Amino acid sequence: KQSPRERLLEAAAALTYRDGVGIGVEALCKAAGVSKRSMYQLFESKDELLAASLKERSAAFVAKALPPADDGRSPRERILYVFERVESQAGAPDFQGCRYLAVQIELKDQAHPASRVAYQIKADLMAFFRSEAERGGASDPDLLARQLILVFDGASARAGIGADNLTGLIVPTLTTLLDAADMH
Amino acid sequence: KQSPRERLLEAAAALTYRDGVGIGVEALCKAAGVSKRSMYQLFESKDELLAASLKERSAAFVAKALPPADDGRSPRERILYVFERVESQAGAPDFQGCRYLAVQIELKDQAHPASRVAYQIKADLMAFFRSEAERGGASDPDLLARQLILVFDGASARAGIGADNLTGLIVPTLTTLLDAADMH
């Protein structure tokens, strides 16, 4: 009870993240249990399949990466929540970094449709940091937002490649940046 | 004048950085002007070729990315130097991020010989920060080193994919981390 279209979207999301964006049409179709013809009937190309898979699964990612809207948390607490999640995921054996940052680095083409979806998803994360920074009174909300997303990408990248498990690193870094921004 | 082996190393460095680690043997050999036979007489595999290109070219990268031996600069100044270089390259048209981080993210295999070489190169950069942190009287040099390399990676990755040009972002971020470490 899962459509060919959903099977393709799931395999694209799973395999590109675990094995890289370069996985081929044959492997993708074999994983999904559909023919090449069926893939082309549903999508313009593998590039668009990947773009759709990132786009149509991002709402559920966002709902888990960010604290809920009605949570009673202060701006600082909400920002920390986001980072606590990264640090928790850094402990998972199958963690290979930020899905979105990885796609953009691997494709090396800002005009690629999947790269554009990934770029937008990550711009929205930055907008979240910007909104919390302003709500918490940061002296320069734009600067703090750029810092937070830089640390998010740095932390995700390094944990994803096994360079740093982030233990004892995230909280002190965020505290330092938040305090420096005069965050209530 | 350039030997087939050196032509291969050069093609590997240029093509993988611009087009991704997935570029094929044919493309590599065409760019190097060498035959497949020559490539395989010289290297066991394209994986080993890439590891060799990264390793043998690193000393020249290091000579440029780091301040020189006896420059009379303070610890803080030497750390700022490293990040000034990244901000400058962030403005360069062909800039695609940190070569070493990219390899590791793209391969999704920490045991891959090129990933291992890239990891070591980046551990050496972290050792540089660690040494300057300690020489600068940092409260916790390990912590600061992990922080600096995290920011290096975040800054390089975001600049590399065109998400942030780093203008007005690096100096204040560094200043904040270095002040927080009690760097004299």
> Which DSSP state fits A151?
H
Q: From CA B103, how far away is CA A105, in angstroms rounded?
A: 10
Distances (CA, A) of A87 to A94, B106, B153, B154, B163: 14, 21, 17, 16, 23
Of A102, A143, A155, the CB nearest to B105: A102
CA distance A58 to A103: 14
DSSP per-residue letters across A94-150: T--S-HHHHHHHHH--TTSHHHHHHHHHHHHHHHHHHHHHHHTT-SSHHHHHHHHHH
**A151 and B CB contact within 8 Å:** yes
In whole angstroms, give the CA distance from residue B166 to residue B84.
10
Cβ-defined contact of B153 to A157 (cutoff 8 Å) = yes
Q: Please check if B112 is assigned to a binding site.
A: no
What ranges do the domains of chain B cover? 1-184
Q: What single-letter amino acid sits at B149?
A: I
Inter-chain contact B107–A20, Cβ cutoff 8 Å?
A: yes
Structure-token pair, residue A34: 């559909």
Phi and psi at A183, nearest 5°, equal -75, 120
* B1 min Cα distance to partner chain A (Å): 32
How many other C-beta atoms are found inside a 10 Å radius of the C-beta of residue B30? 12
Q: Does B75 touch chain A (CB under 8 A)?
A: no
Tokens of B115: 């990933």
Residue of A18, A95, A98, A162 whose CA lies nearest to B111: A162
How far apart (Å, rounded) are the C-alpha atoms in residues A97 and B93? 26
Residue position matching structure tokens 């965020």: A174
Q: How far apart are CA B171 and CA B86, in angstroms?
A: 11
CA count, 13 A, side-chain hemisphere, A47: 11
For residue A31, the tally of other CB atoms under 10 A from its CB is 16
**Does any CB of chain B come closer than 8 Å to the CB of residue A22?**
yes
Residues of B in contact with A115 (CB under 8 A): 161
Distance CA B86, CA B97 (A): 9
Amino acid at B50: L
Q: Which residue of B has its CA nearest to A159?
A: B150
Does B106 contact A152 at a Cβ distance shorter than 8 Å?
A: no
Cβ–Cβ below 8 Å for A157 and B158: no
CATH domain A1-184 topology: Tetracycline Repressor; domain 2 (1.10.357)
Which chain B residues are within 8 Å of A158, Cβ to Cβ?
Answer: 149-150, 153
Contact B155 A154 (CB under 8 A): yes
Report DSSP letters for B157-178, one per residue. HHHHTTS---TTTHHHHHHHHH
